[PDB]
């Protein structure tokens, strides 16, 4: 017959066999490196639209100091149906 | 009326109730309780406490009865009261 | 309890329930079968709308969205056998008003 | 030999050491015999008949090597190679000639030869998340998930 | 310095929302793991054992023992679940039917929906419209399924689809490789042939070659609901955020708190009284033991497959015990209580706890008759009067009535026999202490448990009841007598 | 679809935003919906909905079609938005097949969706103006030039154009365009004459309008799977085998399209004349070697015809199936060892097979293949044929068969691989949002330093920026990196298994 277990078994159970490690070569760190460079010239592209602040405390002579200003693309209507028009 | 306002005549049973009410509660602690309880809990429907029987289930004064309308106080008040000015703004 | 040998009390059985339903007596009846059967007050989590325990949701671990809830003990009951059939009832609570 | 006895069962024991010794050494013999083939560079088809391995060959270096006191037979020795086959590490093709040094099956001649896998390993398995055995349990928020995972951070801090 | 947070809202239920919870969500729910398959200690104090069943930190069941999740006893502890792991899944016998009705729905292969996109256009359509009743839902299940069924090859993948139906108990058989009469497919043809070696080292194989249809067990309809797009999920009539289809197949068993499963120590034997629902579980454990045992120890899959078929049966039993496939030799011996056979019955939570519940603060006597009262008053005896006690509130018009009540006291009729104070709910028994400073001592607001006096009204019914009139409130007078005494003229109503 | 609709969900987290990323898990859920009840659904603004979708819509990722009424519907692309994943690959292999031209027009290409050819050249221009110094300024003829044999090589194709709205019922403007595809001038580049020098970013009417270009990634699918095919059958055989099927391949291509059982044979004599000069082999060796490819028990090529001396094709289908059961052995050895791997071997190459036999053919000793089994059966590496005596189905009186699915296997790795992903991509994220606190105090102390660099520039503020506190958490954002490094690499390499088995999943479907 099967015996009792006193304690749950482990949450994370070790096991004998450990992943193969990563692939090494220069593909390999340029393909990092430029996945890298893609998640940081990808956030500050216009089309990475943030979340609006809003509920402004108070307005300041520093508004205009402190004014994010970003180009913004211009979305072809010609293609885009009228319902996305501002 | 009741038997015929759907445009078909339906019964009284079990089969004739489940297309007339909606209530799952009720329709639950009628008959076939777990088949209902299980088809209610695989299609997500939410009930209501609109009916009588689930407002007992759930201890809350039945809509019918006296629990139909609603009370309000003759207080003396004054609706709007007068707002104090902002100097200020 | 049932029998008076054990101290039992009388039952409002369906019948009784279907008198004082034609009578609309709502808060009779109320009264009746909540307050003075099997009254009680659980903790109900406004989120994720489980049963919690001590003014405590261990679900999302918090209490922020927790409230007190009048509800009948058979009622409580039945909540818990169905969670247990994993029919989970999810209570969405709101004011009064 | 079924219901008692065999060459691979010693006093019924299976000699799991005694048959991964074996293979071992049957694969360093097709690996050799492969290389050598290679190295031939005389001309394709010579170079893959020279890298084909006979049953009959192979049994005969079994038993000129003699691991073991038990006589070994050609077709443990074929079971043996079979099982390489089945490990994905040896191929076997089946070539038509009638009579020869081998005689073993009418008319038909098995040839192996060891060959290297088809793929490298894959990704998946380059990731503590493939092998992880309570991957079913994973979520998000719980006492299983991936910020607080123990595998992962092993992971990384090797 | 302090922080505002509101004490207690007068909140209202509006609706319930039903839904089901999956292996995570349980797991998250839970506080602890049962398992362990005994119930008590092998010291002669009998303490339950620590991470098992009857664990106190789910709850308690005991006047004396406490619960250990929350420090408070049995009349205000709520209780608390715990989730049970299982070695293999198994089919929930409530949702079976609705597990064959997706499969029949999804395809075997992508698990896809065996719609066009023209006919899935037309029932989002159909559905996004508001005031969707149950009715309407089952009724577009109800079609969908027809043309889901009416179809036999995926538009998406290719594959063939054949007919999904129930064989035997709690086993699901998809006929793909049908014999067709007319000229067989190339599928369908190396699905035959593929059993060249099966054959050769079984011939009994060949014989028994037809009627091999695919066997999609717990493991593989699990895996085929875990790859289900979203955007077929609505077109189950399946609400996606109350559940998912991967739930309706259970990894995880949800153990309810004590509260539910009551535990009784007789002391007069060396023995305890358990529900039904603790030793299905207890069954459930050793039975999850024992697969696991098998497996390490490499038993046969003939025999794995009847431990994981008598798993199955046993969850199906402890979730609804009343089946009708089982099979003879599987048959359980005696009778036990699922949840399904608690909830329905005559004496059920429906009908037996909540629709019909018993109440305190009443009585049952035989009637006698009395033509010197009124038609709309009814006697009642001295000593059921002295134990049916009314709450009255102290308030500045009858605060001499109560003081005179409790200067009485419970000896004499009129009188009452408790006190609750506005400022500490604790009650005083007026059977002890001063009356007479307990009456001088009477602030407004506080509740008084008064006698049944005259002018009070009470309810007055006979148990079989036919019409309304069978239960009529009169007012209670006094009498020396011990039985119940109205106007004959009433007499008709109650019959 | 849970797990793909969750690595969908953290990709455009990562990468547009979340109000966005709402919107675009919202339709992947829920399919085609109007803007109006996929907006009351959401529960935002109408404007961050218009701009959600049009987002989405630039980067091909969403479409829009007409139905009833004049009623437009908008349903996204989980295929596109998880082949998104695949940029750094696709950067990589145009990298290695053409020049840094090719990478920047490929890499502006997937950055922005929808570009016109000046443009993105115009772009490429200024960022390689950058790249390279002295004064010297970059031409936008080598970059045209790369363009159109990028174009003509079907790297990069044209978008739907819209069709004439004066020829085409000219009146009333439709709510939509309505776009359509035109194969005949999906490949041709317009004659643009005009030129130009890229700017340095100083920081001191157009001929190819309507005309946008994306990034084809059905011929990197192709290639992928080229590559991988010749790589397999270099590790097989020899690397002369490899290059005879690239030229093969690279045949094939023009003329057989991106789905098809068999690739249309090509001859002896042809695939010698198209072979490079830089190998010495003979016409009787490339014989040689067809022949004996053919007889390969992988079946990569197949002879089907005769005529005009060596006739010869290949099978993609068999190629594709044949790297699947690779993949999947592969992993079943690294998941359970190579004693699980030899039973998984021979379950499959016996199409079935009972437990008794499986000990005989492995010689493996009791207590361990069954459990093995048992293990790859909870682990839905294998299903039980269960063959009943009697429609009782008992279990006393079956035979239960092993047998592996192949498809169903490569789905369940396939989904697998998604979770991995998105487990992956999750514990980035919380590393780098507990981290924050140092990452944000590494910026400072590095910007400090950035500021004034050369205006004003004083040496006092070099000793300095270690003195801070900082000196110790060195380490830790040392660690950090390394961690975020190694994750990235593993979501990069999990890549190829994914596409492996999403392509063998397309390719062993009808869509009938
Ligand atoms: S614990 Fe971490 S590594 Fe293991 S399966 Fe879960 S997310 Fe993946
Ligand atoms: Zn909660
Ligand atoms: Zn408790
Ligand atoms: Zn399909």
Redesign the pocket.
Do not use: A, D, L
């Given at each position: 017959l099967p015996d009792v277990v006193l304690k749950p078994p482990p949450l994370?159970p070790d096991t004998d066999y450990k992943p193969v490690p990563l692939k090494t070569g220069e593909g390999e760190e340029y393909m990092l490196a430029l996945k890298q460079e893609l998640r940081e010239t990808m956030k500050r592209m216009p089309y990475f639209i943030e979340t609006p602040e809003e509920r402004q405390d108070i307005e300041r002579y520093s508004k205009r100091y402190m004014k994010v200003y970003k180009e913004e693309w211009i979305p072809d209507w010609r293609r885009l149906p009228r319902e996305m028009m501002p | 009326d009741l038997m015929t306002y759907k445009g078909e005549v339906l019964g009284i049973t079990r089969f004739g109730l489940a297309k007339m009410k909606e209530s799952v509660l009720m329709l639950a602690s009628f008959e076939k309780t777990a088949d209902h309880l299980f088809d209610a809990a695989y299609f997500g429907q939410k009930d209501s406490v609109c009916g009588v029987s689930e407002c007992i289930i759930m201890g809350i004064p039945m809509n019918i009865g006296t629990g139909l309308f609603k009370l309000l106080h003759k207080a003396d008040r004054d609706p709007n009261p007068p707002k104090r000015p902002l100097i200020f703004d | 309890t049932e029998g008076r040998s054990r101290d039992g009390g009388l039952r409002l059985g369906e019948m009784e329930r279907d008198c004082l339903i034609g009578y609309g007596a709502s808060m009779l009846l109320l009264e009746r079968l909540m307050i003075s059967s099997d009254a009680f007050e659980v903790d109900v989590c406004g989120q994720c709308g489980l049963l919690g325990y001590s003014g405590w949701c261990h679900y999302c671990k918090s209490s922020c969205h927790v409230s007190s809830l009048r509800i009948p003990y058979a009622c409580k009951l039945l909540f818990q056998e169905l969670q247990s059939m994993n029919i989970i009832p999810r209570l969405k609570l709101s004011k009064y008003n | 030999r079924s219901v008692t006895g065999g060459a691979w069962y010693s006093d019924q024991d299976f000699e799991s050491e005694f048959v991964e010794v074996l293979n071992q050494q049957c694969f360093k013999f097709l690996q050799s015999k492969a290389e050598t083939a290679r190295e031939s560079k005389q001309n394709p088809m010579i170079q893959r008949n020279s890298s084909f391995a006979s049953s009959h060959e192979v049994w005969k270096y079994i038993c000129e090597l003699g691991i073991s006191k038990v006589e070994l037979s050609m077709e443990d020795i074929e079971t043996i190679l079979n099982t390489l086959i089945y490990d994905g590490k040896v191929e076997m093709t089946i070539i038509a000639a009638k009579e020869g040094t081998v005689g073993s099956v009418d008319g038909h001649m098995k040839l192996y030869r060891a060959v290297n896998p088809i793929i490298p390993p894959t990704g998946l398995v380059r990731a503590?998340?493939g092998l992880?055995p309570?991957?079913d349990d994973?979520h998000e928020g719980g006492e299983?998930?991936?910020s607080n995972?123990?595998?992962?951070t092993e992971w990384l801090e090797f | 310095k302090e922080q505002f947070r509101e004490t207690d809202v007068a909140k209202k239920i509006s609706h319930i929302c039903f839904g089901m919870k999956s292996p995570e969500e349980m797991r998250q729910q839970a506080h602890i793991q049962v398992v362990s398959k005994n119930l008590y200690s092998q010291d002669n104090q009998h303490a339950p054992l620590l991470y098992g069943v009857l664990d106190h930190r789910m709850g308690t069941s005991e006047k004396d023992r406490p619960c250990e999740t929350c420090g408070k006893n049995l009349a205000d502890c709520l209780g608390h679940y715990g989730y049970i792991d299982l070695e293999l899944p198994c089919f929930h016998v409530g949702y079976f039917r609705a597990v064959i009705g997706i499969l029949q729905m999804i395809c075997k292969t992508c698990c896809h929906i065996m719609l066009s996109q023209e006919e899935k256009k037309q029932f989002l359509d159909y559905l996004k419209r508001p005031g969707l009743t149950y009715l309407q839902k089952r009724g577009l299940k109800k079609k969908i399924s027809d043309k889901c069924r009416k179809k036999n090859i995926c538009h998406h993948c290719g594959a063939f689809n054949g007919t999904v139906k129930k064989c035997g108990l709690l086993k699901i058989i998809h006929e793909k490789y049908k014999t067709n009469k007319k000229v067989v497919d190339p599928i369908v043809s190396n699905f035959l042939q593929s059993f060249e070696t099966a054959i050769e080292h079984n011939k009994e194989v060949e014989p028994l070659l037809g009627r091999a249809q695919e066997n999609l067990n717990p493991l593989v309809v699990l895996n085929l609901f875990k790859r289900i797009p979203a955007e077929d999920v609505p077109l189950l009539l399946m609400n996606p955020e109350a559940g998912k289809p991967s739930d309706l197949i259970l990894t995880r068993l949800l153990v309810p708190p004590l509260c539910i499963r009551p535990s009784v120590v007789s002391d007069l034997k060396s023995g305890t009284n358990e529900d039904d629902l603790t030793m299905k579980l207890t069954e459930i454990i050793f039975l999850n033991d024992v697969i696991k045992k098998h497996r390490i120890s490499g038993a046969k899959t003939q025999m794995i497959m009847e431990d994981w078929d008598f798993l199955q049966l046993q969850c199906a039993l402890y979730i609804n015990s009343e089946l009708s496939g089982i099979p003879l030799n599987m048959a359980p011996k005696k009778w036990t209580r699922g949840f399904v056979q608690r909830l329905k019955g005559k004496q059920g939570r429906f009908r037996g706890n909540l629709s019909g519940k018993r109440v305190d603060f009443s009585g049952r006597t035989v009637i006698s008759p009395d033509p010197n009262l009124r038609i709309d008053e009814v006697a009642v005896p001295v000593h059921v009067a002295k134990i049916l006690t009314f709450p009255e509130k102290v308030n500045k018009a009858n605060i001499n009535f109560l003081r005179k009540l409790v200067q009485n006291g419970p000896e004499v009729h009129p009188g009452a026999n408790f006190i609750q104070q506005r400022h500490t709910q604790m009650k005083r028994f007026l059977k002890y202490g001063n009356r007479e400073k307990m009456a001088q001592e009477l602030k407004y607001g506080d509740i008084v448990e008064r006698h049944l006096i005259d002018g009070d009204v009470v309810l007055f019914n006979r148990q079989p009841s036919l019409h309304k009139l069978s239960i009529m409130a009169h007012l209670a007078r006094v009498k020396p007598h011990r039985t119940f005494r109205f106007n004959e003229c009433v007499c008709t109503p109650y019959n | 679809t849970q797990a793909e609709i969750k690595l969908c969900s953290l990709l455009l987290q990562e990468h547009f935003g979340e109000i966005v990323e709402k919107i675009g898990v919202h339709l992947i859920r829920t399919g085609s919906q109007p803007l109006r009840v996929i907006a009351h659904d959401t529960g935002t603004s109408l404007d961050q909905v218009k701009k959600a979708l049009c987002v989405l819509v630039q980067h091909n990722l969403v479409s829009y079609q007409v139905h009833k009424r004049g009623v437009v519907e908008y349903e996204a692309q989980c295929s596109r938005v998880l082949r998104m994943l695949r940029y750094p690959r696709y950067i990589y292999t145009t990298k290695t097949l053409y020049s840094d031209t090719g990478e920047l027009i490929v890499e502006e290409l997937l950055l922005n969706g929808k570009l016109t050819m000046s443009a993105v050249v115009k772009k490429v221009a200024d960022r390689l103006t950058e790249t390279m110094e002295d004064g010297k300024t970059m031409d936008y003829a080598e970059v045209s030039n790369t363009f159109v044999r990028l174009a003509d090589t079907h790297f990069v194709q044209r978008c739907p154009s819209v069709p004439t709205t004066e020829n085409s019922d000219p009146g009333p403007p439709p709510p939509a365009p309505t776009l359509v595809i035109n194969e005949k001038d999906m490949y041709l580049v317009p004659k643009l004459s005009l030129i130009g020098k890229g700017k340095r970013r100083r920081s001191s009417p157009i001929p190819d309008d309507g005309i946008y270009w994306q990034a084809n990634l059905d011929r990197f699918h192709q290639h992928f799977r080229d590559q991988a095919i010749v790589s397999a059958v270099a590790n097989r055989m020899d690397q002369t085998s490899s290059e005879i099927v690239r030229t093969m391949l690279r045949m094939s291509e023009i003329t057989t399209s991106s789905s098809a059982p068999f690739t249309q044979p090509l001859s002896s004599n042809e695939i010698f004349r198209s072979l490079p000069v830089g190998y010495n082999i003979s016409k009787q060796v490339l014989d040689q070697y067809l022949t004996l490819l053919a007889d390969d028990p992988l079946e990569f090529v197949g002879k089907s015809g005769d005529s005009g001396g060596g006739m010869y094709v290949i099978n993609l289908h068999k190629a594709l199936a044949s790297l699947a059961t690779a993949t999947l052995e592969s992993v079943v050895q690294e998941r359970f060892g190579s004693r699980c791997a030899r039973i998984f071997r021979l379950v499959l190459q016996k199409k079935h097979i009972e437990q008794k036999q499986v000990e005989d053919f492995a010689m493996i000793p009791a207590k361990e293949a069954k459990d093995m089994l048992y293990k790859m059966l909870s682990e839905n590496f294998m299903s039980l044929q269960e063959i009943p005596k009697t429609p009782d189905h008992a279990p006393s009186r079956t035979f239960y068969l092993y047998t592996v699915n192949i498809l169903s296997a490569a789905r369940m790795l396939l989904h697998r691989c998604y979770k991995?992903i998105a487990?992956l991509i999750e514990?980035r994220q919380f590393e780098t949002k507990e981290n924050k606190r140092l990452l944000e105090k590494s910026q400072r102390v590095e910007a400090i330093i950035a500021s004034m660099q050369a205006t004003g520039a004083e040496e006092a503020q070099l000793q300095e920026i270690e003195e801070m506190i900082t000196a110790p958490e060195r380490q830790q954002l040392e660690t950090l990196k390394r961690n975020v490094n190694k994750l990235d690499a593993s979501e990069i390499q999990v890549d190829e298994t994914i596409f492996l088995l999403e392509s063998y999943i397309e390719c062993t479907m009808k869509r009938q």
């Open positions: 994370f | - | - | 503590p998340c992880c309570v991957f994973c299983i998930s991936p995972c123990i595998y992962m | - | 991995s487990n514990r």
